[PDB]
């Protein structure tokens, strides 16, 4: 049987970056030449592996992480990067062995009145560990006094909403990102 990569890149909807979606791929074959051959992906950067030389490599598990961010923030989906996304939403380790794939989806994830259902985490006391998925809705205590779940001054909701309008610039248009993590071997080419 073939690997279900079509269910990820082709999903009619994508998850927010703070609650990023992950697909565990095991016990199947897959040809990665089909993916790189397509020039629809604006970004396609592999780390510690060759794109074409992947059909001859077997891996124990292959993780596919998919979410949506801004065009300006695609540069943060890479090892050793900082920023609101890499620190508080999706962090890649320094020894990352995989590939980062992204493409512009301003035609899909952008309402004319503004698509606000794609969110990101704006407040966090410390950065995320690699592959950490924080989905807490707890109010952020930025002041000396506690919040007790009462959103207000020095007590802000930790998440912020993307303002995805089709009139936005490329850096502000939504980009659908898929991050492949190459970890008995069950996924070959």
């Amino acid at each position, epitope marked *: 049987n073939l690997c279900p990569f079509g269910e990820v890149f082709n999903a009619t909807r994508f998850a927010s970056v703070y609650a990023w979606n992950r697909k565990r791929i095991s016990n199947c074959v897959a040809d990665y030449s089909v993916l790189y051959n397509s020039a629809s992906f604006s970004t396609f950067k592999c780390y510690g592996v060759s794109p074409t030389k992947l059909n001859d490599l077997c891996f124990t598990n292959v993780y596919a992480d998919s979410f949506v961010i801004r065009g300006d923030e695609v540069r943060q989906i890479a090892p050793g990067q900082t920023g609101k996304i890499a620190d508080y939403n999706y962090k890649l380790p320094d020894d990352f062995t995989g590939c980062v794939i992204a493409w512009n989806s301003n*035609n*899909l*994830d952008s309402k004319v009145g503004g698509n606000y259902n*794609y969110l990101y985490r704006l407040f966090r006391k410390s950065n995320l560990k690699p592959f950490e998925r924080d989905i807490s809705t707890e109010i952020y205590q930025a002041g000396s006094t506690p919040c007790n779940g009462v959103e207000g001054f020095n007590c802000y909701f930790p998440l912020q909403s993307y303002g995805f309008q*089709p009139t936005n610039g490329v850096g502000y248009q939504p980009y659908r990102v898929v991050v492949l993590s190459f970890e008995p071997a069950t996924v070959c080419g």
Partner: antibody
Framework: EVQLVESGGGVVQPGRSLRLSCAAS????????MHWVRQAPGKGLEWVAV????????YYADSVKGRFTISRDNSKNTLYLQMNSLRAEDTAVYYC????????????????????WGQGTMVTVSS | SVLTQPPSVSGAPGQRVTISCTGS?????????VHWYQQLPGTAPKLLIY???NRPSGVPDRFSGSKSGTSASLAITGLQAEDEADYYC?????????????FGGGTKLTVLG
């Protein structure tokens, strides 16, 4: 097969009422929204109204505002258009067309088009 | 504000014709998408282009769409006699933010038989 069958059209005196029914089959009618589009003879298309997946909100063109009422029965997979106080300019071929999927579609529902049209029921108005 | 289409375009078989569709600040200039419909005489409209440039499965590759600023264009390459029909562009209106759509006046394509 995905199929939209509308009926209930005919001839009626001005100022009187008429109701059109649009049967749907071959797709999860509950999720998609539904449109009503009319076309006078020889002229172009003119959008009438639209209704959501649940019917919470409705939108109408100014030509039929207050006179027409759109509704849907998701348990019956049927679309309705209550035409009251009809005028002569309402004489046209009335189609029902599938709108976008707001439930499990794309976020930009404007990306969808009227992909499935009906066969067109006919209405005429004269005294 | 509605859409403006040429009343009729004409082209010999094998040629390429284009149908324009100009709008305003409340529809195509507001960044909405443009859909194209083909209507044979006496029949219901058929969706030719959705989302400015995409073709539904079953539509011949001869048809193509585009959009720029406040206008959209439908390109029919290699005209066939069967392409003689009426063509409508459709977008959405944002005068007041709700959900309103706008059609064009329609273009009668006549292949020089």
């Amino acid at each position: 097969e995905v199929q939209l069958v509308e009926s209930g059209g005919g001839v009626v005196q001005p100022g009187r009422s008429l109701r059109l029914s649009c049967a749907a089959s071959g797709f999860t009618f509950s999720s998609y929204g539904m449109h009503w589009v009319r076309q006078a003879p020889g002229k172009g298309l003119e959008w009438v109204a639209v209704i959501w997946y649940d019917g919470s909100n409705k939108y109408y063109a100014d030509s039929v505002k207050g006179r027409f009422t759109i509704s849907r029965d998701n348990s019956k997979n049927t679309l309705y258009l209550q035409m009251n106080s009809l005028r002569a300019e309402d004489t046209a071929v009335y189609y029902c067309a599938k709108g976008p999927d707001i439930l499990t579609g794309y976020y930009n529902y404007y990306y969808y088009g009227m992909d499935v049209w009906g066969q067109g029921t006919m209405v005429t108005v004269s005294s | 504000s509605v859409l403006t289409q040429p009343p009729s375009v004409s082209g010999a078989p094998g040629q390429r014709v284009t149908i324009s569709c100009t709008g305003s600040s409340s529809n195509i200039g507001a960044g909405y998408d443009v859909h194209w419909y083909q209507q044979l005489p006496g029949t219901a409209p058929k969706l030719l282009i959705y989302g400015n440039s995409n073709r539904p499965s079953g539509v011949p590759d001869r048809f193509s769409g585009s959009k720029s600023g406040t206008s959209a264009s439908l390109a029919i390459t290699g005209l066939q006699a069967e392409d003689e029909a009426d063509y409508y562009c459709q977008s959405y209106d944002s005068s007041l933010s709700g959900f309103y759509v706008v059609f064009g006046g329609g273009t009668k394509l006549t292949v020089l038989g």
